[PDB]
Amino acid sequence: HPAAHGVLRLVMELSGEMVRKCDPHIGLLHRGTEKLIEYKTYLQALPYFDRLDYVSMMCNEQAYSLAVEKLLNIQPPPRAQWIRVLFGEITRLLNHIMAVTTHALDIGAMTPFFWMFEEREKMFEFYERVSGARMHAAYVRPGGVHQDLPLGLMDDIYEFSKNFSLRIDELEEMLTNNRIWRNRTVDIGVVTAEDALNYGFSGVMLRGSGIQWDLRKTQPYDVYDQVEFDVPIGSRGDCYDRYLCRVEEMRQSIRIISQCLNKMPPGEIKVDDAKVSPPKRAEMKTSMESLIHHFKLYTEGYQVPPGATYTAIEAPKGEFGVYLVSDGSSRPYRCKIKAPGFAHLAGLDKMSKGHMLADVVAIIGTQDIVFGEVDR
Amino acid sequence: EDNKQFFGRHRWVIYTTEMNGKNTFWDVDGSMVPPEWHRWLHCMTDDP
Amino acid sequence: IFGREDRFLNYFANIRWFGGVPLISLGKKTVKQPVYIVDVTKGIINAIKDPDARGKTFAFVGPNRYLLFDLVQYVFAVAHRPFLPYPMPHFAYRWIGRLFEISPFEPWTTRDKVERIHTTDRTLPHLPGLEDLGVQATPLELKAIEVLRRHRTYRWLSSEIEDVQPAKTV
Amino acid sequence: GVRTSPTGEKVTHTGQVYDDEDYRRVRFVGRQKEVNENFAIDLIAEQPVSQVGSRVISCDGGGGALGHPRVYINLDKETKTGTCGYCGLQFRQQH
Amino acid sequence: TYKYVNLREPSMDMKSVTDRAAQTLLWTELIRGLGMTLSYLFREPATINYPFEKGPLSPRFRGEHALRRYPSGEERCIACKLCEAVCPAQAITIEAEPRADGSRRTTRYDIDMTKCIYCGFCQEACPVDAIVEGPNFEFSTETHEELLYNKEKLLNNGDKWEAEIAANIQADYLYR
Amino acid sequence: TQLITVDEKLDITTLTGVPEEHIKTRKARIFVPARNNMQSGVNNTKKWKMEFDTRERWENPLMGWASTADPLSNLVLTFSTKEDAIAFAEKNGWSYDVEERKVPKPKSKSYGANFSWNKRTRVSTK
Amino acid sequence: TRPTVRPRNDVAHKQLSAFGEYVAEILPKYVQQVQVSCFSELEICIHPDGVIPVLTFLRDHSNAQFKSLADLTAVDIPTRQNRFEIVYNLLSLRFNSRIRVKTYTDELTPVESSVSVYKAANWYEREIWDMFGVFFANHPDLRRILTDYGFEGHPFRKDFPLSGYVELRYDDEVKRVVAEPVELAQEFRKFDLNSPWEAFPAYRQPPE
Amino acid sequence: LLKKTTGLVGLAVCETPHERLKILYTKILDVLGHIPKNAAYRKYTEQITNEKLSIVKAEPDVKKLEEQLQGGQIEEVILQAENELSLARKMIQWKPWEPLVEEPPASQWKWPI
Amino acid sequence: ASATRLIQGLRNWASGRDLQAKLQLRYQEISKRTQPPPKLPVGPSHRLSNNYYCARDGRREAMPPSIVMSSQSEKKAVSPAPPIKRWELSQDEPYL
Amino acid sequence: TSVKPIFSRDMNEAKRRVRELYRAWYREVPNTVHLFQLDISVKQGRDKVREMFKKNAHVTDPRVVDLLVIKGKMELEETINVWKQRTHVMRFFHETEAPRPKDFLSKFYVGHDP
Numbered sequence A: 001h002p003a004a005h006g007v008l009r010l011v012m013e014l015s016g017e018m019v020r021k022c023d024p025h026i027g028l029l030h031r032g033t034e035k036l037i038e039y040k041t042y043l044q045a046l047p048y049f050d051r052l053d054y055v056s057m058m059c060n061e062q063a064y065s066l067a068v069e070k071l072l073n074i075q076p077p078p079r080a081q082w083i084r085v086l087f088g089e090i091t092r093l094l095n096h097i098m099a100v101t102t103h104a105l106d107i108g109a110m111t112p113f114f115w116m117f118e119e120r121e122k123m124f125e126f127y128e129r130v131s132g133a134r135m136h137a138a139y140v141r142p143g144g145v146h147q148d149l150p151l152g153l154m155d156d157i158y159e160f161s162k163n164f165s166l167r168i169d170e171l172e173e174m175l176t177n178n179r180i181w182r183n184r185t186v187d188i189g190v191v192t193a194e195d196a197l198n199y200g201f202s203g204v205m206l207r208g209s210g211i212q213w214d215l216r217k218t219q220p221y222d223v224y225d226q227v228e229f230d231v232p233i234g235s236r237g238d239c240y241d242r243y244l245c246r247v248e249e250m251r252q253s254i255r256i257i258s259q260c261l262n263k264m265p266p267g268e269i270k271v272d273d274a275k276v277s278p279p280k281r282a283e284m285k286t287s288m289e290s291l292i293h294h295f296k297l298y299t300e301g302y303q304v305p306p307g308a309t310y311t312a313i314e315a316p317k318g319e320f321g322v323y324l325v326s327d328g329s330s331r332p333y334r335c336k337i338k339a340p341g342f343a344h345l346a347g348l349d350k351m352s353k354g355h356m357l358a359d360v361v362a363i364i365g366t367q368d369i370v371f372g373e374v375d376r
Numbered sequence B: 001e002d003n004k005q006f007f008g009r010h011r012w013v014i015y016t017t018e019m020n021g022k023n024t025f026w027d028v029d030g031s032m033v034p035p036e037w038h039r040w041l042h043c044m045t046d047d048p
Numbered sequence C: 001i002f003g004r005e006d007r008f009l010n011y012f013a014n015i016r017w018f019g020g021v022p023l024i025s026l027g028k029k030t031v032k033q034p035v036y037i038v039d040v041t042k043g044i045i046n047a048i049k050d051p052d053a054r055g056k057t058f059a060f061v062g063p064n065r066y067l068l069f070d071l072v073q074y075v076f077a078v079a080h081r082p083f084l085p086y087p088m089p090h091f092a093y094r095w096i097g098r099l100f101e102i103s104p105f106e107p108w109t110t111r112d113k114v115e116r117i118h119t120t121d122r123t124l125p126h127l128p129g130l131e132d133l134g135v136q137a138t139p140l141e142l143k144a145i146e147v148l149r150r151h152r153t154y155r156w157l158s159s160e161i162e163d164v165q166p167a168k169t170v
Numbered sequence D: 001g002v003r004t005s006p007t008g009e010k011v012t013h014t015g016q017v018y019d020d021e022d023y024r025r026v027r028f029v030g031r032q033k034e035v036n037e038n039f040a041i042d043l044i045a046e047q048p049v050s051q052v053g054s055r056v057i058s059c060d061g062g063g064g065a066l067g068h069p070r071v072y073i074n075l076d077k078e079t080k081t082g083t084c085g086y087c088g089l090q091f092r093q094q095h
Numbered sequence E: 001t002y003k004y005v006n007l008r009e010p011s012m013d014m015k016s017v018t019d020r021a022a023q024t025l026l027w028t029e030l031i032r033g034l035g036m037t038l039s040y041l042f043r044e045p046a047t048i049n050y051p052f053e054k055g056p057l058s059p060r061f062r063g064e065h066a067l068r069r070y071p072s073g074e075e076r077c078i079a080c081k082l083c084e085a086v087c088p089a090q091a092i093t094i095e096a097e098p099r100a101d102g103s104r105r106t107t108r109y110d111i112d113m114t115k116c117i118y119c120g121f122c123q124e125a126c127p128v129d130a131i132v133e134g135p136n137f138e139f140s141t142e143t144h145e146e147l148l149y150n151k152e153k154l155l156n157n158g159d160k161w162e163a164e165i166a167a168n169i170q171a172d173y174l175y176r
Numbered sequence F: 001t002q003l004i005t006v007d008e009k010l011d012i013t014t015l016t017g018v019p020e021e022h023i024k025t026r027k028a029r030i031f032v033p034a035r036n037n038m039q040s041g042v043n044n045t046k047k048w049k050m051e052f053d054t055r056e057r058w059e060n061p062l063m064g065w066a067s068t069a070d071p072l073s074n075l076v077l078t079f080s081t082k083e084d085a086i087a088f089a090e091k092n093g094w095s096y097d098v099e100e101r102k103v104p105k106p107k108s109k110s111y112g113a114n115f116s117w118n119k120r121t122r123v124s125t126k
Numbered sequence G: 001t002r003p004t005v006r007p008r009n010d011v012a013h014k015q016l017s018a019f020g021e022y023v024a025e026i027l028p029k030y031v032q033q034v035q036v037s038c039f040s041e042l043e044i045c046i047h048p049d050g051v052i053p054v055l056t057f058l059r060d061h062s063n064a065q066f067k068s069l070a071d072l073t074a075v076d077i078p079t080r081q082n083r084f085e086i087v088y089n090l091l092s093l094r095f096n097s098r099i100r101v102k103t104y105t106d107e108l109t110p111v112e113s114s115v116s117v118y119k120a121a122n123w124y125e126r127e128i129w130d131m132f133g134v135f136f137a138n139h140p141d142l143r144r145i146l147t148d149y150g151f152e153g154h155p156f157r158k159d160f161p162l163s164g165y166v167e168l169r170y171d172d173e174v175k176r177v178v179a180e181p182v183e184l185a186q187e188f189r190k191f192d193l194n195s196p197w198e199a200f201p202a203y204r205q206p207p208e
Numbered sequence H: 001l002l003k004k005t006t007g008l009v010g011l012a013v014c015e016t017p018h019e020r021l022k023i024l025y026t027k028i029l030d031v032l033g034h035i036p037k038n039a040a041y042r043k044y045t046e047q048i049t050n051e052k053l054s055i056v057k058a059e060p061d062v063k064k065l066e067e068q069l070q071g072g073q074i075e076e077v078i079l080q081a082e083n084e085l086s087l088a089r090k091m092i093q094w095k096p097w098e099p100l101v102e103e104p105p106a107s108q109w110k111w112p113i
Numbered sequence I: 001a002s003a004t005r006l007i008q009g010l011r012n013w014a015s016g017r018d019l020q021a022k023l024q025l026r027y028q029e030i031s032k033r034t035q036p037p038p039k040l041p042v043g044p045s046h047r048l049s050n051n052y053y054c055a056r057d058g059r060r061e062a063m064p065p066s067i068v069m070s071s072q073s074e075k076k077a078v079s080p081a082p083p084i085k086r087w088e089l090s091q092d093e094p095y096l
Numbered sequence J: 001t002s003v004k005p006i007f008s009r010d011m012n013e014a015k016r017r018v019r020e021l022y023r024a025w026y027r028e029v030p031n032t033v034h035l036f037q038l039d040i041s042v043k044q045g046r047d048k049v050r051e052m053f054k055k056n057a058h059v060t061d062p063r064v065v066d067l068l069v070i071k072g073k074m075e076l077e078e079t080i081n082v083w084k085q086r087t088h089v090m091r092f093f094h095e096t097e098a099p100r101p102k103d104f105l106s107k108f109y110v111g112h113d114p
């Protein structure tokens, strides 16, 4: 179905056209990720997180890296943290363009899809220049980032962030003021604050309901406390307020991208602990301890101290959590991925009460749901 | 090459009509470019 | 051999487009024992695996011998179509049978198909069969519905296997 | 230096060749068997032995960081030439 | 640290009410959307003319795999099995034995391209720069088993794309 | 009291979904793993392990890879004590073989014994 | 220890220890163990029979207000007689904190469902029933959510192998997708990567 | 102040916050009076509810009371009082001040194994 | 930026903005495809003196979790943390 | 030895639940034959139900049979609604797997397995 995000089976009991019951059957994209993660090392399970949320790759990379660094009692260098935050905001722009354009496509506006996919292609070019792959970068690693930026990337990011404001202005001229766009979103999917809190909703689902909660402001991480940005707050809980919140989040992401471009510090890219991060390739072919550590890191992997932790970040879809349990070996004993899509699809049944078929597809679109992270 | 065009359109290739014994007048291929020109065509370097 | 992609049961189910399924003397003199395709495939596989099957001449036959009239009756009863046969002579059958063969594409029927349809199956008990290769012969009543469910209309598409009267064998 | 089997098949540098009675040659009829005609042993046998005037020598393969890890080779024995473990280049003390 | 999105109160005065009624009865913002589409009609389209006009890439690009050689003819790999130990999808199979001159060289080096995820762990865990991820990406086949590369195919790919792989490594080796 | 009395042995053979062929024909082995003699560390000989018998592995016709048909070929289970492993074994209805732990015998080292006066423990050289 | 070692937070550690003592002394009937990790996370290991009276407390007390259920998880450790470890993660927006509540059960003993506390768990523990076999008593709709319709067994159990006991392929004789016993073309090569030398002396268990 | 909206969806504006808060706090104290004194839940809930009731009684304004109660809007304060009362009734029904039900197994909370 | 002035004027009128200042198609203003080779610096642990690993180990400073209450006063009630401060309004675009 | 029951206090309630589940399955079989358009008879489906019920006939534990009843009710609910396909229903009839060797001699002939 062009409406469902790839794989999704709504068994819908309808009273002609009005929905009476919705049963989302999922598991068509269940790959069984968190058993094969237990069957692989930490560096080998790092590319697993690029495919859960296949439009938020470096956000999941940062979540996994933060969890592993918390278990390892180490921290990345400041330049690595600034690179991670800048590319996380680029990734947030990617995810929000995908969400708004696909949602307008299922509503019926197919033109902003083609308008914003050019900017999506430019950000993919930035991804390819920084890592070598367009989507699944495998760039953010525990200890910092794998490689430094190629020269001249900052100027290209600056030009793109200069023109992206006009692109957002064109999109908002197209969609926000339109009456037909409002008629599909003014009074569709109203969620109260208490019902959103009790259903495990996180991210925009809270912020469209007037609940002031952002994980980059309340429980911040590496250098998100050094930047300045605003948090959009909804008033009615409908799809219109949350679409406006997503557009405002794109604006604030542009603001954070500019602030990160103007404040990048010099230094290294990895942690200097050679028992966690691999050494430089010139040092590997010259020094002895560097070659030994390179061998034991690319064959066995580092040893994580035993214990369990739960590290959560603010992915563009909401709170993205990793529950990691390590038994002291070089492979994780348990690694559960908490994605917002599970809770949002669970709340979809209460979201679509007394609505219509097109109202159900608008409610499905207004929750930016990918099923790789839903089915794990 | 024509650098007045925008990025992505400033370099192009007209394929031959005879490559390794095959009549490629119509059936052009993207893998018919030698690697030394594949560096320049894919904008990986500024030097042909 | 009958099956999903055969030209034996499907041919009988497709005579209904032309008219009222004519036969030679109503087809009450020719005896046939059709065999399932999977039984023949298992027999061939076992003969490949059998070192004692070399040099023999097997004869693969079905379990029950039917007349042609009752076979067409059972085919049309499973397919849930009206069955209105009529006498038609042997010489006039080939005359219209050769009319369908002048098509440049795959013909619907020929004179040879008419001859082989109205030829009674000989019995050769001396030739070893499917039972000597360890293959049980599946009767037509178990797979006829599976073959002929494609030819039913929407009205009787959902009827079960047991809602039919099996034909009389000889 | 690729030799040809009596069946007509080519022999790789490993020495792999399907037998006359091997059925798997059905994968090659109507197609080609992909082998490489640049054998590494024959090409490394053409490299001349380098005469040096030191007891030990250091080898990195050339290019610096684009080569193998740097190793040290002893050339005390005069009957045989010391060979690099990675690159296969052989050196000899000229005394 | 937060802003009240969509809480603005509309006006009440007669001129603004007349303006809103005129916009209602005459469809002004629909004309605005029409004008934006008409503006996008008269721009230069961003479509490149494939296959004569390839998209831009980077020297760090990850594509088809290849096996390099030293600049004397000797193959670079010494069968250390780091790449098959670091490959997350277990796409690499290595079997080795000492050859005629006593050199540690491979006998079987198989990469399953349908298992490979193209992440460059093997090209960054290789201590002698033997296995590389070349820049080729136009190698789609019509059959499944043609994507099961043995050692001979990888060596042929290395000999085919060495003139580009060496330049890419010379460009990007200082960042590693 | 919301409690019942159950006196029968535990049996989760019908709930685990394993086919009977891999239940009545398998023979698990519970053992402390042997120390690798090429190394000197003893940290790999701390926890008991449950392993299964090795079934047939053949060669692929196409690439020569190690094809298998045994689902339990790579199943290693870790237990702290022998009793926990034996309880997990009889819970799932697996026939088991238990090997005793082979703790090395302590020695009596002496550096002066290399320089004896009337004994044979004198070192030839050092 | 400045540029590489992660900085230590002691105020959060002291506050979490004080709140753990507060929770333990409020509910002595169900709370068994309270611990604080080195990276300032609080774990409350409780009896299964107090799954409901604890959680609602943390949902409704004026000093806790853990209104959000972040993640519901299960851990399979076969070395214990109660092999399944159900873990609740709670987020408090009012006091800006996170807590973890752990409980234990085996295969046969059911545990009380918390759908009357957080409705997100209506799916979450259902997922556990699909992948661990822990039956959650008093559930509205408990069935499979991720595996195949005709799937047998719980895949995330540690005694369950990586590849399943069945596989699907298309058969043209029956014109259907059929299930057959698995036959891997290449076996998953099991790697022995454990270092034989002791790594962390701080976690050294005493010998028997 | 006469707030037009509380800022959240599905939450109605309370016209009289002081009287409703006093009623809820007095009802909570009367319910907690039944619990035995040796239970720590009664002492802690009585302490925090008495402090909150003194804060509500002392401040005649709404914005100053909201800013010094440290609970945000007064509507979520009233909702938290309702939830505390419901918890008090459930805790009377449950009685968790009894000693421990059962000791855990010897290898239940040991990590790593 | 190759179209004639009539098309640019009609486009600017129909859009309502100025599109020639910000074009979505890249031109010669972008960075060159070839760059001078870099020289990445070293980190703080690249020293020859006073660089003992035991004084800067990260993993070895981890400890087992501090168990507080186990089953083998008139203190104030305590929250997990002090309550979160009320969010201030944005001074740039308050939308009020 | 005191454990927590699931549904049945003893064996009688558990076997009563087994009986009710068998009644429900026996009533349900003709509907799944009719709706899925299977090419098998009703007696074949009922004997398959009887075989699946008699496969677990050696269980003498109330909690295990309670879990078996719960799983059977789950499968019955999954087959009352058309959530199973024709493949999922027909997977109980192994129509594509050849019968394995049974005696010692054929198992000796065909492989090393016991």
Ligand code: SF4
Pocket: E083, E086, E087, E088, E089, E090, E091, E092, E111, E115, E116, E117, E118, E119, E120, E121, E122, E123, E133
């Ligand atoms: S690129 Fe990655 S997945 Fe592919 S062969 Fe190399 S290590 Fe394996």
Ligand code: SF4
Pocket: E076, E077, E078, E079, E080, E081, E082, E083, E084, E094, E122, E125, E126, E127, E128, E129, E130, E131
């Ligand atoms: S990592 Fe390099 S040298 Fe080692 S086995 Fe692989 S290709 Fe050969």
Ligand SMILES: [Zn+2]
Pocket: D059, D060, D061, D068, D084, D085, D086, D087, D088, D089
């Ligand atoms: Zn060398």
